Amino acid sequence: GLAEKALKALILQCEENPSLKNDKDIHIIINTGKKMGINRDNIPRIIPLTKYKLFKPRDLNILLITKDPSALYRETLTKDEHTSELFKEIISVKNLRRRFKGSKLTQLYKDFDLVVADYRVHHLLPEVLGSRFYHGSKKLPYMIRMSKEVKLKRQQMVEKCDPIYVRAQLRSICKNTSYIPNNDNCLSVRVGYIQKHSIPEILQNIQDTINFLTDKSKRPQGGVIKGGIISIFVKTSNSTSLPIYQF
């Protein structure tokens, strides 16, 4: 009962307070009994939802960053009529560094809502994009496989692209949500939008997320919490902590 009661309270406080109206996302912060031994990189680690979808590519604009050549990538993606309406913009890293700096960079930051790049370029990405993107997890660059094909030692790779696979990645991503490991007990994840869905959906999402995080299976991805979990607080971008599952 505490959960949805606090949810109603935080909602009404949002619609009353000016700025609390202006910030628009629900965030939940889990404090764990033990710290995490996983040092913070910026690899966007995502968590699955079993019940309810959240965002749709049809609803969101999107940016893709390729490898350097990008000719066949872009033309194929724009041609195969499964992504031509889907990816708002496509750019190579070198062209990006040639085109945007400073002011225009933060202009991008304001414009786009979700970006992704090839997993062979993600680690290079930060310096061309900027600490300005690299805050929080709202416009944290994602990482999608692009070929559905692998590399072997001493074997040249061959590069391809398939809209079915890539569109599957995007739809999966916007269906579910993500997180980033830390080295202390405090980890934060955005959970749901303030009007796209309802309190029962919120609670279902929360329960599925906590079950995934506590699940013994999928240790490389889901079994990451160490020790008995302490509690879960809820907030928006500027609100105060609200307690759930105190013990």
Binding site: K5, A6, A9, L10, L12, T240, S241, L242, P243
Partner: peptide, 17 residues
């Protein structure tokens, strides 16, 4: 009516410390 008093308890424990 929850937000104000949960804030209150927050500052209460701070001032108590």
């Amino acid at each position: 009516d929850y937000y104000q008093q949960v804030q209150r308890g927050k500052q209460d424990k701070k001032i108590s410390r």
